[PDB]
């Protein structure tokens, strides 16, 4: 109300409204789903189009051979943050000959987003990210919120109508975690999860976007007729 003019102002109840408004931009964004087993980690994203003549906005970005994320909200902010991850993943490789740990990648994103919430002049990031990766401690899935809060999960979903996919994963928790050494079945579970967040529209060939990373599987994105298999 009077305490939402900038990010440097607490409300009387201890709330940061500019951060909460940035959080709102994610809910307006298109749905995306993340889930993993012990061997693989999968991202499934519902891409959004402006109209029938337009292309479908890309939702998944690669950060390294073993790490990448999906976005929901302001795409340019996701480009800034993904670019930052690319550099951090790359710094770890060049200096330490070491693939960046997914947990540590989340810590870096948290600290970068935080600086924007405490300083005057700047603004919070207007995007949420689902980071997947495979490092020395197996498969991982992270959820990034622009408040700074990063959370390691078995599965999750963000965007509009994401609650439906999140409930599905909460029921399927015991099943999909056990899908080891089988990428196609893990993707199926992800495609079935994101389907719970759909209304009116359904998954078409240029609508769906899938990515995967695993034990002997580099981070690779699937679009177009490559995902027709899973429709």
């Amino acid at each position: 109300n009077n305490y939402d003019g900038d990010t440097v102002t607490f409300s009387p109840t201890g709330r940061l409204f500019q951060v909460e408004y940035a959080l709102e931009a994610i809910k307006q964004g298109s749905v995306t789903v993340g889930l993993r087993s012990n061997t693989h980690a999968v991202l499934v994203a519902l891409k959004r189009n402006a109209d029938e003549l337009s292309s479908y906005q890309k939702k998944i970005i690669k950060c390294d051979e073993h790490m990448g994320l999906s976005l929901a909200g302001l795409a340019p902010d996701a480009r800034v943050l993904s670019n930052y991850l690319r550099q951090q993943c790359n710094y770890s490789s060049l200096v330490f000959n070491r693939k960046l740990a997914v947990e540590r990648a989340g810590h870096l994103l948290c600290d970068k987003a935080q600086k924007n919430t405490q300083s005057y002049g700047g603004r919070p990031y207007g995007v949420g990210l689902l980071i997947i990766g495979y490092d020395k401690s197996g498969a991982h899935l992270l959820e990034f919120q622009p408040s700074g809060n990063v959370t390691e999960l078995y599965g999750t979903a963000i965007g509009a109508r994401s609650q439906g996919a999140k409930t599905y994963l909460e029921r399927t928790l015991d099943t999909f975690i056990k899908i080891d050494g089988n990428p196609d079945e893990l993707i199926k579970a992800g495609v079935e999860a994101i389907s719970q967040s759909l209304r009116d529209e359904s998954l078409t060939v240029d609508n769906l976007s899938i990515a995967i990373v695993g034990k002997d599987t580099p981070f690779t994105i699937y679009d177009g007729e490559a995902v027709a298999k899973y429709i």
Binding site: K62, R86, N90, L94
Partner: protein, 222 residues
Amino acid sequence: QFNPYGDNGGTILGIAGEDFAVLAGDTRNITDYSINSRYEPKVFDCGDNIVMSANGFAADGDALVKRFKNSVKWYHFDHNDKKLSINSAARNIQHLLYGKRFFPYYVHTIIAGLDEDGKGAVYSFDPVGSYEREQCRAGGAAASLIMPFLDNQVNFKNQYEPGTNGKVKKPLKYLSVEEVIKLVRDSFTSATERHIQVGDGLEILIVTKDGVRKEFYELKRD
């Protein structure tokens, strides 16, 4: 006074075939009259069907290769996983080298691969980024021993056809991968005999449309 440069010896050789390319280099690494390693890889696969070697001062050589490999990675990120063509790689390397014009990478760089028409390609660089596409190039310590042999046996220089006596040149027939590898091996055996910084082992990287293959051969260890 601190001298930031050194000489790690060694020698490299690139030859461009009709539908393939090879980049060879000895595996010996030295300082002065001492051997550091008998097997220290010098020719690297940099992705996108490109092989590279930066012979001379190894610290600068490793730095350059590392930075080019990095350049290939960021080329994919920035341009939708587009394949970096050998001609584009060569121009990129010029800017890396000339970037340190006033404190140079003390190396003779050679890259090899295939051009966009699928033909074999070798590009050669000086330390400050001047480059040129060539059919044939030896670089490093024993380059002066090997290049003349290649002018003769690859480009058929000073060779004419019997009976005509200097009138008709020897025709420039193409060389197969088996024929090239023979010339590479003899080049390095000869260089090893007369150059003290060359020896121990020979490692050859062969580039075709199918990918990058490796071959290793022993050299004299004295």
